[PDB]
Structure formats: structure tokens, C-alpha cells
Design a protein around this ligand. Sequence first.
Ligand SMILES: CNCc1ccc2c(c1)[C@@H](CC[C@@H](O)CO)[C@H](CNC(=N)N)[C@H]2NC(=O)C(=O)Nc1ccc(Cl)c(F)c1
Ligand SMILES: *[C@@H]1O[C@H](CO)[C@@H](O)[C@H](O)[C@H]1NC(C)=O
Ligand SMILES: *[C@@H]1O[C@H](CO)[C@@H](O)[C@H](O)[C@H]1NC(C)=O
Ligand SMILES: *[C@@H]1O[C@H](CO)[C@@H](O)[C@H](O)[C@H]1NC(C)=O
Ligand SMILES: *[C@@H]1O[C@H](CO)[C@@H](O)[C@H](O)[C@H]1NC(C)=O
Ligand SMILES: *[C@@H]1O[C@H](CO)[C@@H](O)[C@H](O)[C@H]1NC(C)=O
Ligand SMILES: *[C@@H]1O[C@H](CO)[C@@H](O)[C@H](O)[C@H]1NC(C)=O
Ligand SMILES: *[C@@H]1O[C@H](CO)[C@@H](O)[C@H](O)[C@H]1NC(C)=O
Length: 335
Amino acid sequence: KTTLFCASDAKAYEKEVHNVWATHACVPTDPNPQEMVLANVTENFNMWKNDMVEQMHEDIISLWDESLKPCVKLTGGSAITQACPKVSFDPIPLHYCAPAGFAILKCNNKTFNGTGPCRNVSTVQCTHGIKPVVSTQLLLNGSLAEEEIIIRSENLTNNAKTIIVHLNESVNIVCTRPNNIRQAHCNINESKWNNTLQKVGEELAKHFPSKTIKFEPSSGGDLEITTHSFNCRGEFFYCNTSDLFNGTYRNGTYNHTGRSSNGTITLQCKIKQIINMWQEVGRAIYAPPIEGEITCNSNITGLLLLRDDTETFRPGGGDMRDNWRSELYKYKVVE
Ligand SMILES: CNCc1ccc2c(c1)[C@@H](CC[C@@H](O)CO)[C@H](CNC(=N)N)[C@H]2NC(=O)C(=O)Nc1ccc(Cl)c(F)c1
Ligand SMILES: *[C@@H]1O[C@H](CO)[C@@H](O)[C@H](O)[C@H]1NC(C)=O
Ligand SMILES: *[C@@H]1O[C@H](CO)[C@@H](O)[C@H](O)[C@H]1NC(C)=O
Ligand SMILES: *[C@@H]1O[C@H](CO)[C@@H](O)[C@H](O)[C@H]1NC(C)=O
Ligand SMILES: *[C@@H]1O[C@H](CO)[C@@H](O)[C@H](O)[C@H]1NC(C)=O
Ligand SMILES: *[C@@H]1O[C@H](CO)[C@@H](O)[C@H](O)[C@H]1NC(C)=O
Ligand SMILES: *[C@@H]1O[C@H](CO)[C@@H](O)[C@H](O)[C@H]1NC(C)=O
Ligand SMILES: *[C@@H]1O[C@H](CO)[C@@H](O)[C@H](O)[C@H]1NC(C)=O
């Protein structure tokens, strides 16, 4: 363990806050990317015990609190007020790099579940570009598995450990508050969701070989975790997923029990101003939403699940360290 440094293609002239942060905190990425393969050198990784995840977590916390200043911040009996202007918000890729005297080993097994021994390992200076996308239930704008869908979890038998589902084909999702000012909706093409969830059921059945797979909405908790919550153009979208995680996989076939209309699922959402923070235990209070068409067209690249005759799976999340682990799993900082 050392202190790693970030590398970004951010531009000192753009007023978008990811660029503003990265110019002030990261070095320019090098087009000197020397990757060195070692086929008979073999190393052990644990994506769930990886200090790079905590370093990136600290970095993104700093980013958000220097870039999404809430009008009010309520923590531990104290309140903190500051200017809370609307900003230009669109995440950019970030690379994480070992300093001199250190390397980063990268597992080239296309089917690696993030834990155990990898036989094909390569050394690099920096990770690939990672967008610090804060979200729950669905992992957005990530990178896709190269072969089959991969299931990752610290302990599959423990029902309290988060399950990361790494997809191999993206599912487009278009969320929009169009031109009540806090009502918005997401559109998802239900046939891609159908095929995606059946193949996900296939892999989940491989880890549970009876065992009829069930997808049901989030049980309970804070609105941030019981909905697909994310930030788009600076606004905090909370999107109902009752019609999304709602189906059954049995006897090798998937049937979607959530309601859809002419072939698309639409999630109902509110843009909220009181936010249960993910950075720490507390609440953040922002101004009402901007004027105009607020839309993000994103790619679903992964899922965050929690497991309850059968096994039921519900969308999870809330600890965005899992969001970072979904991209940092191939890596291991070495001396
Ligand atoms: C079984 N699950 C465990 C679980 C469950 C919920 C939560 C955690 C853990 C915490 C993670 C803390 C850890 O990371 C240490 O730093 C975090 C605690 N904090 C407060 N309850 N206030 C809390 N998650 C959030 O509130 C959160 O994700 N909100 C949020 C905001 C904006 C956007 Cl756009 C968004 F999509 C989400
Ligand atoms: C991941 O693979 C390793 C073997 O390489 C195995 O020990 C571990 O149980 C696997 N975990 C999951 C969640 O499949
Ligand atoms: C994705 O993985 C599934 C199995 O999990 C497979 O059936 C499907 O063909 C894969 N898609 C690719 C490789 O494009
Ligand atoms: C996971 O939990 C089970 C039971 O709680 C335990 O037997 C096992 O050793 C744990 N670790 C694993 C499977 O890696
Ligand atoms: C999602 O919508 C369903 C039906 O519209 C509702 O029963 C459920 O409580 C909603 N979830 C949240 C977190 O509001
Ligand atoms: C699936 O959706 C239907 C209609 O939207 C709803 O009645 C049902 O309760 C949902 N399944 C759940 C919540 O497990
Ligand atoms: C998936 O959705 C389409 C509608 O877009 C539906 O006609 C089809 O039967 C569904 N397939 C499965 C396996 O649920
Ligand atoms: C995903 O990337 C696209 C393209 O830059 C962007 O429009 C969208 O807002 C991104 N999604 C999120 C949640 O940032």
C-alpha cells in the first residue's frame, strides 16, 4: 500500500466540475502506456480487500463536496450552509497510477470473478479510465465483460454481502425530466431487459444449481437504495424500479412479471432536494431543479443485487465502494 495518483484528460478551460476538480488534483494521462504481460507469473487478487477502492472513494468524496455544494448540510447535530449554484455536471474518466517504486498488476482472465488466483497477469502504470458514476441498483456507464456475464461477491452464501453482476452487453436507459417540475421518467427497451435478465438468471442458477431465480423490487430502506437513485446534470433523480426487478426464471426460461407498455418499461422518478448522503451519515439540501430538458442517456453495464424452495434477488447498493470495485477488480497495487 502506497498513495496513488490520478491521471485525467480533463481540460483547464471547461467549467464542468469533474474537469475543474481533475485539473486541480490529477496529472495528464500519458500516451506512454506500457503494458507488460507475464503468462507464468500468477498472482492472487481480492476485489473486496483492495485499498485502491478506498483511495478512489476518498477522491470521489472530495470531488463531490468540492463540486456539489449543498445549500444545507446536516451532520451530527450541526448544519453547514454555503453557496449552492447550479453547475455543469458530467463525469469524465479517471486513471489511478502507482508512484515510482510501485506497479499495478492487472488480471487478463476474461472470466475472472474478482477473487482468487489469476494465471495471466500484466503490469501497468495506470488503470483504465473510470467514470466516478454514483448510483444505486444499476451500474451506469461502466465497462463490459469481454466474454460471459460475471457474478462477483465477497461471500455468495452470506445474504448480506452485495452481489455485483457484470454484464457483457449494455442495456440503454434514457431518463428525462421533460420541458410538476420534479416528475421525470426513464425508458428501457423491455426486450433487451428480457434477454439480459434471463442470461443473468442462467448464471445465478449456476451458482444456485431447484433454486428458481426471482427478481423482486427493493425491500425497504432509505429512498436512495429502494430506488434507482443517481445524479444527472446535477439533479438527484430517484427512479422507481418496481416494474424492472420483477420477474421469474424457472426451468431455464425467464418471464417478466413487471408492467410494460408497447414494449418499453418506464420508471417513474422524482428529482429530490433532500438527499441522504452516500459520502457520510447525514443529509444534503439542494436548490430546486434547473429549467428545461434534463436528460441522461446512459448504458446499464451492471447490477447491484441482494439475496433474501427458491432464491429471491432484489436491487441493492448504497455503498458506492461497490461501484468502484466493479471497475477496480482486475487491479492490485504492488511494490
Ligand atoms: C446493505 N446496505 C448498506 C448501506 C445502505 C445505505 C447506505 C450505506 C450502506 C452508506 C455508505 C457509507 C460508506 O460509503 C462510507 O463512506 C450510506 C450511509 N450514509 C447515510 N445513511 N447518510 C447509505 N448510502 C446512501 O445514503 C446513498 O448511497 N445515497 C445516494 C445519494 C445520491 C445519489 Cl445520486 C445516490 F445514488 C445515492
Ligand atoms: C471465484 O473464483 C475462485 C477461484 O478462482 C473461487 O475460490 C471463488 O469461490 C469464486 N467466487 C465466486 C463468487 O464465484
Ligand atoms: C453474454 O453472456 C451470455 C452468458 O452469460 C451469453 O449467452 C451471451 O452470448 C454473451 N454475449 C456475448 C458474448 O456477446
Ligand atoms: C461465507 O460464509 C459461510 C457461512 O456464513 C462460511 O462457511 C464461509 O467460510 C464464508 N466464506 C467464503 C465462502 O469464502
Ligand atoms: C415504486 O412504485 C410502486 C408502485 O408504483 C410502489 O408500490 C412503491 O412503494 C414505489 N417505491 C418507492 C420506493 O417509492
Ligand atoms: C410487479 O409489477 C406488478 C405491476 O406493476 C405489481 O403488481 C407486482 O407487485 C410487482 N411485483 C413485485 C412487487 O414483486
Ligand atoms: C420480452 O419483451 C417482449 C416485448 O418487447 C415480449 O414480447 C417478449 O415475450 C418478452 N420475452 C420474455 C422471455 O419475457
Ligand atoms: C453516461 O454517458 C453519457 C455520455 O456522456 C451521458 O450523456 C450520461 O449522462 C452518462 N450517465 C450518467 C449517469 O452520468
